[PDB]
Structure formats: C-alpha cells, structure tokens
Design a protein around this motif. Structure first.
Motif, PDB file in Angstrom:
ATOM      1  N   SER A   1       0.826  -1.221   0.000  1.00  0.00           N
ATOM      2  CA  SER A   1       0.000   0.000   0.000  1.00  0.00           C
ATOM      3  C   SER A   1       0.857   1.265   0.000  1.00  0.00           C
ATOM      4  N   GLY A   2       0.263   2.372  -0.427  1.00  0.00           N
ATOM      5  CA  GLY A   2       0.959   3.658  -0.491  1.00  0.00           C
ATOM      6  C   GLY A   2       1.300   3.999  -1.924  1.00  0.00           C
ATOM      7  N   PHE A   3       1.538   5.273  -2.148  1.00  0.00           N
ATOM      8  CA  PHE A   3       1.930   5.728  -3.501  1.00  0.00           C
ATOM      9  C   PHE A   3       2.803   6.956  -3.370  1.00  0.00           C
ATOM     10  N   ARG A   4       4.063   6.834  -3.772  1.00  0.00           N
ATOM     11  CA  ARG A   4       5.019   7.897  -3.601  1.00  0.00           C
ATOM     12  C   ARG A   4       5.693   8.174  -4.936  1.00  0.00           C
ATOM     13  N   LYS A   5       6.157   9.398  -5.089  1.00  0.00           N
ATOM     14  CA  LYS A   5       7.103   9.682  -6.155  1.00  0.00           C
ATOM     15  C   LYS A   5       8.364   8.902  -5.819  1.00  0.00           C
ATOM     16  N   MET A   6       8.703   7.903  -6.615  1.00  0.00           N
ATOM     17  CA  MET A   6       9.783   7.007  -6.258  1.00  0.00           C
ATOM     18  C   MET A   6      10.818   6.966  -7.380  1.00  0.00           C
ATOM     19  N   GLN A 122      12.231  12.099  -8.823  1.00  0.00           N
ATOM     20  CA  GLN A 122      11.569  11.706 -10.083  1.00  0.00           C
ATOM     21  C   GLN A 122      11.058  12.949 -10.820  1.00  0.00           C
ATOM     22  N   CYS A 123      11.221  12.978 -12.134  1.00  0.00           N
ATOM     23  CA  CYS A 123      10.750  14.094 -12.988  1.00  0.00           C
ATOM     24  C   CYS A 123      10.022  13.483 -14.184  1.00  0.00           C
ATOM     25  N   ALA A 124       9.132  14.248 -14.805  1.00  0.00           N
ATOM     26  CA  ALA A 124       8.534  13.831 -16.085  1.00  0.00           C
ATOM     27  C   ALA A 124       9.004  14.810 -17.164  1.00  0.00           C
ATOM     28  N   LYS A 132      10.361  19.986 -14.601  1.00  0.00           N
ATOM     29  CA  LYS A 132      10.235  20.788 -13.396  1.00  0.00           C
ATOM     30  C   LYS A 132      11.126  20.111 -12.365  1.00  0.00           C
ATOM     31  N   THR A 275      -9.627  14.506  -1.422  1.00  0.00           N
ATOM     32  CA  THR A 275      -8.287  14.305  -1.962  1.00  0.00           C
ATOM     33  C   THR A 275      -8.175  12.911  -2.563  1.00  0.00           C
ATOM     34  N   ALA A 280      -4.773  17.275  -3.661  1.00  0.00           N
ATOM     35  CA  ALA A 280      -5.994  17.976  -4.017  1.00  0.00           C
ATOM     36  C   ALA A 280      -5.999  18.421  -5.474  1.00  0.00           C
ATOM     37  N   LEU A 281      -5.027  17.960  -6.269  1.00  0.00           N
ATOM     38  CA  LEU A 281      -4.920  18.244  -7.697  1.00  0.00           C
ATOM     39  C   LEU A 281      -4.797  16.924  -8.445  1.00  0.00           C
ATOM     40  N   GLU A 285       2.332  13.132 -13.380  1.00  0.00           N
ATOM     41  CA  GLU A 285       3.730  12.730 -13.551  1.00  0.00           C
ATOM     42  C   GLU A 285       4.006  11.296 -13.103  1.00  0.00           C
ATOM     43  N   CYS A 295       2.446  -0.397  -7.501  1.00  0.00           N
ATOM     44  CA  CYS A 295       1.150  -0.799  -6.924  1.00  0.00           C
ATOM     45  C   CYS A 295       1.031  -2.301  -7.047  1.00  0.00           C
TER      46      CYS A 295
END
Lengths: 296, 296
Positions: A1-6, A122-124, A132, A275, A280-281, A285, A295
């Motif tokens: 579980s969980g979701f991070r920029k990794m 991590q960047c896209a 960015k 959320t 909230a957006l 990316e 996941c």
C-alpha cells in the motif's frame, strides 16, 4: 500500500559522477568507460563552439573523480555535449544505454554539485519539453535515467534553467529536448498541457490503494472524452493509451472509458474538498509503468 | 530553482541490502560489518519469540548477498530485530550510525524486495509514529536513513502495514516507533496532527522559489497563532521552532511571526483556487533542514 514519487536506486549512477573544470567554470560530468560527458558550455567564458574548442587543449580540462584526478587525453564535441577521453576506464561503469525519452515519460534525476551526488528525485518530461526539476547553480551535467534489470538507460543531461524556473537539457547524444539552445537568448518554455494517460494511470493507482469516491456507474466514448480533454488543456487520449491502460483496468475491473467518465466529472466539478492519494490536484507525472511498478 | 521531494543518494545503502530467508518467509536484511539485521518476525510460522529463536539454528537462516550465500555463524535477538552474525564482513559497509528520529523529521527509504533495491523516496515520521510509505509484500527489512558527509544514519527498519495502509517499524536497535507490536492484533494508527514548523518551512521554500500570493503585511503573536493551530489540528509552534526558522526568515526577510499570519489566513480561508509549489494543500513533510538543503 501507499503511492510515492519514487526514484530508481541511484548507486549505479553515483559511481559515474565526476567534476569537470575548465577555466573558472566547474560542473558535473558522466564517466562511462574511458569517456567523460558534460555540457559543452563548460568551455564558455553568441559563441562559436567549434572555435572555442579548437582553442582548448587537453590540459585545460581538470577532471576529478572523488579524490583522483583523471588525465584527459582527448577532447571532442558531439552536438551540445563535450566528450573528454581520459586515460582510465571507470571501473564502476554499469551496463548502460543512451535513450531519448518522449514527453509524458518519467525518469530519475541524480542532482549533483562539484561531482558529488546530493539527492535523487523523479521528474517527467513535460509536453513542452521542459522538466520541473530542482537544480541550483553548479548542477549542470547532472543526469536523468531509468534502470531496468541491471541496465542504466541515460536519457537526460542538465544544461540550463529557463526564466519560469523550469529546466532544459539534452539527451546523452547532446541533442536538446525542445526548442532550446545553450547560448544567451530570451528563450522561454512554450505552453504546456496535462498528460492525460498519466492522470488516468494515477486514478487507477488511487483505486488500487482504496480511494473510490470519484468512481461512477457511467462510461463515456473516446470521442466525447477527447472533446472534454481539449477544453481543459489535456492531451488527446488515443486507443494506444487505452490499450496501455489495459492491465490496470483489468486488475481494478474499471474499464478505461469508465475511468474517463470519472476524469470528466473531476475536471468539470473539482473534488469538493476531497483528496486522491494525498493530493488535491490531478497528478500527471506517473506513467502507467510507474503505477504498475509500485502498486502491482 | 524548483522544489521536489528529494531522497539522499542510495548507493551506500544499496551495497548493504541482502536477502534473509527462514522457512518459507523471505524478507530483507541490512548487512553492516559481519552482522545482518532484519525483523525478528522472519522466524514466525501470540508468539514467544525467545522460544521461537531457541528452537532455531544458524543453518535455518539463508542469507544471500546478490549471488553470494553468506554463512550464518551466530544468531541473537535484540528487541524486535534479529542479528545474524555472518562469516564475512561487508566490504561495502559505509561509515554509519544508528540514530532514532523524532516525529516531524524526514528520512529516505530504500524500498527493497528479495534483497534487491527497487526504489528510493522521502518519508516523514508522523506525529502518531507511523509513516506513509510505499511498501508491498516482501518489503519488510527495508530501511530508512539520512546521509551527512560520508556517514549513513540509519533510523528506520520496516516491519508492518497497519489497516489504514500506513506503515510501522523500528529503529535499528529494534525498538518500535509508536505503540505497535510485531504480533497479530487489531492495532491501528492513532490520531495524527499536522507538523506546523514543516508547513512554515515549506512556505519559506515557496517564497524563495517565487510564490508570494499568500504573503501579507500582518504579524501575529506566538500565543495567538497557537490558538489557531490547535483549532486546525496543527502542532504547537515553539520558540525553538521560531529559532530554527531563523535562517530562512533572514534570507527571505519575512519574520517567522509574519509567515505565521500567512498560515493563519491560509487555514481560515484556503487557497481560492491557487497553488503553492505545485500543491493545492499545505505540505508538512519538509523540515527546515530539507528546505535549506534544496533551496539555499
């Protein structure tokens, strides 16, 4: 579980980072086999780079790998990168490739100063070919990469910061991403758009992690959804995107065009104070691959 | 310019990750000098761990460092971690410390499966002593750390996922963060709060990066602000927090209690459709140190 920029583990890239100095300019280089790659703008003091490089010698380049000075035995230019041949092959060279990425794709950045790695994130690659990132003075020559099995696919080398604070650079063949140049101009990022397939991938990540409030019983048509995408400055969704989302759709049992109806609702009404995965957006990316990687 | 969730470079930790198997349970271990540290729950098949370990022998533990099997020559328990003495000192052992972190502090996580590093990300220790990580089955024994100069300060070892999907674990001495146990219970995360000093640090990061719309000419008193903090489930702000924010206040020229007036306004009215550093929420997982490290 969980979701991070990794990010990918950065060790294989850390062992390739060196310091390149020419004149009073210091920045970072990438040491693979017996070649050090770095931005050619290190030789600047408008410019005619072929003239600038003819006037240089091997001894004008100081290359430092940690505490070891690497003797430069040859120098050449390839598009916007400099290739410094050194007398020592890097013993920590990983299996690697030079790949060019597409807008919408993600990669890890090893931010570096004075040849010393500072952090990884991590960047896209944005649709407008900027990233960015998070870079300070001295970060030029930091690289972006992905890792698959034992192989480092280098896709980005950092060259500059644009006026809005976003970042521009090249592939490792020295060819810029986007309509940018390594000289002094008023160049600026063009208009950007939101990466639709990535937003849908992230909504699937949210469902996998138990966020379901945005789901609904409706389904839309690809054409009807793409009308809404255009209105909200989202990229068109293609049948190939639908196909790439197949595995996530199957795992969650939510058809892609069903999720598209959720995204239409979110674009037209917002979140009403709720959320998704801590945001909230709408997050764009994470690629479908990124979601499947974390996941499963 | 830019502001990202940024992890420390993970190489020094990657070279310490091994696979530990006992019975049919495989998870990760940390190999430093001639000791492998891992969660003691690897020996489970309620439990009396002292009994479970008396019934084991060195040969019941299979430790794999990449493709090399490490022979276990001793085993002992220290709180909730197992210490497996092996016949080989890890040649890649970094300079390291075992430190315990405080709620509000951040660290990098090297998520690992089968002894193989998969990704790196930043986490904060929540006030309720959980972390919002990204972990799948097989991730136990993954570690959290910070790096200063050449020294790895290990602060976290992963043990479990709680029902809400957040994560719990120990320091490297085997002592749990928070009121959690490595046995089967209905244990759940307690109520959490928002880390106020970190929110203020992130607002300073935003100002440094050119986001100013939330600024105002007003200043508040510490007591008046802490009344508002309590109302919105924010942690109290202390004079020490004000002092720690000193350097960021000086760089931006915005006094801490001036920024507190901005935060009060944001809590009472929201953002009115605007964003700060790409977020539509107030971010509390960057410490003042994290901000100074990336913004300077």
């Amino acid at each position: 579980s969980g979701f991070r920029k990794m990010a990918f583990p950065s060790g294989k890239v850390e062992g390739c980072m060196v310091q390149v100095t020419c004149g009073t300019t210091t920045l970072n280089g990438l040491w693979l086999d017996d070649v050090v790659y770095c931005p050619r703008h290190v030789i600047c003091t408008n410019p005619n780079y072929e003239d600038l490089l003819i006037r240089k010698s091997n001894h004008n380049f100081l290359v430092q790998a940690g505490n070891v000075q690497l003797r430069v035995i040859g120098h050449s230019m390839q598009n916007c990168v400099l290739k410094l041949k050194v007398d020592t092959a890097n013993p920590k060279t990983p299996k690697y490739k030079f790949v060019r990425i597409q807008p919408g794709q993600t990669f890890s950045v090893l931010a570096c100063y004075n040849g010393s790695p500072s952090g990884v994130y991590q960047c896209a690659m944005r649709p407008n070919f900027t990233i960015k990132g998070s870079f300070l003075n001295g970060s030029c020559g930091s690289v972006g990469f992905n890792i698959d099995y034992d192989c480092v696919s280098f896709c980005y080398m950092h060259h500059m910061e644009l006026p809005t604070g976003v970042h521009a650079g090249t592939d490792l063949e020295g060819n810029f991403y986007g309509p940018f140049v390594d000289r002094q101009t008023a160049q600026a990022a063009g208009t950007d758009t939101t990466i639709t397939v990535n937003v849908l991938a992230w909504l699937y990540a949210a469902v996998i992690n138990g966020d379901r409030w945005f789901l609904n019983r409706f389904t839309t048509t690809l054409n009807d959804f793409n009308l809404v995408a255009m209105k909200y400055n989202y990229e068109p969704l293609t049948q190939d995107h639908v196909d790439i989302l197949g595995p996530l759709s199957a795992q969650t049992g939510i058809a892609v065009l069903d999720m598209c109806a959720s995204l239409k609702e979110l674009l037209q009404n917002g979140m009403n104070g709720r959320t998704i995965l801590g945001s909230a957006l709408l997050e764009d990316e994470f690629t479908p691959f990124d979601v499947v990687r974390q996941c499963s």
